[PDB]
Design a protein around this ligand. Structure first.
Ligand code: HEM
Ligand code: NA
Length: 378
């Protein structure tokens, strides 16, 4: 193989490896994984937006998928539209003034808990994860579960996304998916009318699709926000000058766009080819699996010159960290609002967060995440 996606040196910093792949071929056949690896921006953008020839529902290539496992992320048009519009409608019903107030208060509270800490603190377990958990459960309108236990179940699902590389990772993910399903079932039965769960219940599609899709909102919301915050904090702690900018709404728009482009946690996004189709110069055939390395696409220098740097003058609307097309991230607006509020809380907190040891990364290849981010607080 080109490299081991779970090798420690790759996990420590995968972007040079992505770049070597991209420089050799933006659409490369990985024979041991039996998949195309797509690292070019143009090709990833093409595949994401074409659900006619590239799908997320493996039933379209004659794979058996029981009805009880269907979900918004594994359905394609036309079945995808009903549950997708249901979720968007429930999202759009949430008043943004309240959402922003909740997100800002959570971020400020967890930062204030850090003030007065004289030793080394781990920003993953002390900020990124608890903020994400309270953020997603406030949005859902449900009581937060225990943070440590919830992180353990959720982590099993994240690791299972790499089961094609390490098959032993599949089984813990399935047990964990079942646990999160029971959690979601309890919320469906008991949640207040305030919040996203109450709105989704009102809008309601097969009950299995709704429950699995809400589980997806919970897990995707928690893990994506948690891991984005960890990566962004890692960059801010090494480059505090990023927070020393104008700090106006528009200046922070550009900064947030760059932070999501660079530190968006989704490294890989898979599709199946339903009908033979060229991708770049290559012919992809019905039945082929494609892994879109969207974090690599977000460092493609043909689109992002000096790709590894924060540059505040790039054209907006280019990065693929939220996907593109029918399956584009449901929470992209919530996530940008949330990160804006974190930046604002950091600036108002007046706290200096200096490195107290290296950023340490977890052996997760699909969804990048820090295992630990040790800092001193001054
Ligand atoms: C509260 C925050 C979030 C929620 C509630 C959320 C929820 C979701 C949901 C439900 C989907 C599936 C959409 C569909 O298949 O139609 C999705 C897709 C996606 N999310 Fe988010 N997400 C959140 C934050 C984030 C963040 C912070 C990132 C990355 C920075 C992200 C990256 C993505 C990507 C790349 C996809 C597309 C996957 C694909 O191509 O199928 N999400 N998200
Ligand atoms: Na084992």
């Amino acid at each position: 193989p080109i490299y081991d996606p779970l090798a420690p040196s790759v996990i420590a910093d995968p972007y040079p490896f992505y770049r070597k792949l991209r420089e050799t071929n933006t659409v490369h056949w990985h024979e041991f994984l039996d998949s195309w690896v797509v690292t070019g921006y143009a090709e990833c953008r093409q595949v994401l937006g074409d659900t006619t020839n590239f799908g997320s529902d493996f039933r379209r290539i004659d794979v058996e998928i029981p009805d009880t496992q269907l979900s918004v992320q594994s359905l394609d048009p036309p079945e995808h539209g009903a549950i997708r519009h249901l979720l968007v409608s429930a999202l759009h019903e949430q008043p943004l003034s309240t959402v922003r107030q909740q997100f800002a208060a959570i971020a400020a509270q967890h930062l204030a808990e850090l003030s007065g800490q004289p030793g080394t603190v781990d920003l993953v377990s002390r900020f990124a994860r608890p903020v994400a958990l309270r953020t997603i459960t406030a949005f859902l309108g449900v009581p937060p579960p225990d943070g440590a236990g919830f992180e353990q179940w959720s982590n099993a699902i994240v690791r299972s996304m790499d089961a094609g590389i390490e098959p032993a990772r599949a089984e813990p993910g399935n047990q964990a998916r079942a646990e999160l399903s029971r959690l979601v079932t309890h919320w469906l039965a008991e949640a207040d009318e305030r919040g996203f769960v109450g709105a989704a219940r009102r809008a309601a599609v097969p009950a299995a699709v709704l429950a699995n899709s809400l589980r997806a909102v919970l897990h995707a919301g928690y893990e994506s926000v948690s891991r984005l915050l960890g990566g962004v904090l890692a960059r801010l702690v090494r480059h505090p000058e990023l927070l020393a900018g104008p700090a106006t709404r528009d200046a922070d728009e550009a900064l947030v766009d760059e932070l999501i482009r660079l530190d968006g946690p989704v490294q890989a996004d898979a599709r199946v080819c339903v009908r033979d189709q060229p991708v770049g110069a290559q012919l992809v055939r019905r039945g082929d699996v494609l892994v879109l390395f969207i974090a690599a696409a977000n460092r493609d220098p043909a689109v992002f010159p000096d790709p590894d740097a924060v540059r505040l003058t790039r054209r907006r609307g280019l990065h693929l960290a939220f996907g593109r097309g029918a399956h584009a991230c449901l929470g992209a607006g919530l996530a940008t609002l949330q990160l804006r509020e974190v930046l604002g809380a950091l600036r108002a907190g007046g706290l200096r967060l200096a490195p107290a040891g290296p950023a340490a990364y977890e052996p997760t290849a699909t969804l990048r995440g820090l295992a630990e981010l040790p800092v001193s607080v001054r």
